[PDB]
Symmetry: D2
């Protein structure tokens, strides 16, 4: 139910080995850790969660763009890229968060399917 | 060797049934038709060409964004989105042209693999 | 030293009357208020800070994109758009759609 | 009536000294030269045309992104970036990376 895909606009490639941390807002309004992983050789991250565990909530997907660029020996601008959204409010959906990265820029979109 | 993927930034969905026309620059510097198709329910267009037919050249991928929006009953800004590139100059590659559409904006990236 | 500019990819316009709050990260890893305002008719927010106030540090720009889309009658995906960067003249530009946003930095 | 603005997503800067040629589509479906210039230090190209010259029609903005990247020593993917639209004040903005570009229209 939750997938992340990341592309690199400088190299013309998937963005491989990008760390992604997902948080869920708790009852007390703090962010609680929900899941994490890293993108594969295709720039995709599957397996973050399950239909059972991906309940309604406000979720934050934090893509570690900084470490990605630094590993390439590049000094990037942003600390991270985050996507924060309310999930499953009108019933279960599947969410793909797609991101396109450059050292001084990022773009994200969501693909939501029923 | 050539795939096109299109997403819709307004609906949060694949951009389905988008016409895509591919041209190749001929010897006389004119654009010649090379291949065409339309995106599927996943927003993807496979099958445009083959390894045999996708020789070196300068290619134009013209994504019919205008008809896409008009079909949704929306009046868009651009006539189309085009990506023009030299292909296969240092040997065969696989190319994915990924696009993200809004009525007054588009973004494209290339994923090139060996 | 810091300018925010917001554009609307649906309407092909500046994103006007967008609330923007800027925070600086404190030593305890909490976020100190720093600047705020609403984008103008040109989608720009100028006058956030001065050179003497704007010291090196990690800054967060929180753009209230949800209220923007709802005031236009459009259901938005995101709760907000928050842009976090280290300062080491900065323009933070954002291009908004209901299910997507893009941001770039122009540092001159 | 027509302005072009170009930004560089790699360097976090305006894209300076970018050649831009504007064409208007003729009745025979060929392309008549209309305006051209190079982006300034702010990445902007102003003064392309006047109100009386800028009539309704289909316009093509051809941005020489390949020469831009090569002058910086960077191998680019695209031959150029060409933006085609009907005019029915227009800013055509483009954000460049070596393998990607994004463009939006701001019509006010
Ligand atoms: N997330 C993104 N922000 N900007 C983009 N520009 C082009 C493509 C993607 C994208 C990724 C995967 C498939 C299709 C599109 C973009
Ligand atoms: N043309 C564009 N494509 N993608 C973009 N992403 C962020 C910002 C801009 C942009 C440019 C000028 C002002 C405000 C926004 C972008
Ligand atoms: Ca509910
Ligand atoms: Ca060759
Ligand atoms: Ca320092
Ligand atoms: Ca008319």
């Amino acid at each position: 139910p939750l997938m992340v895909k990341v592309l690199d606009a400088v190299r013309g490639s998937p963005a491989i080995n990008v760390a992604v941390h997902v948080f869920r807002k708790a009852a007390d309004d703090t962010w609680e850790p929900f899941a994490s992983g890293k993108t594969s050789e295709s720039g995709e991250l599957h397996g973050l969660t399950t239909e059972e565990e991906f309940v309604e909530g406000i979720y934050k997907v934090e893509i570690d763009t900084k470490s990605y660029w630094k590993a390439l020996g590049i000094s990037p601008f942003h600390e991270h890229a985050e996507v924060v959204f309310t999930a499953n409010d009108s019933g279960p959906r599947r969410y793909t968060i797609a991101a396109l990265l450059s050292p001084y820029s990022y773009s994200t979109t969501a693909v939501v399917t029923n």
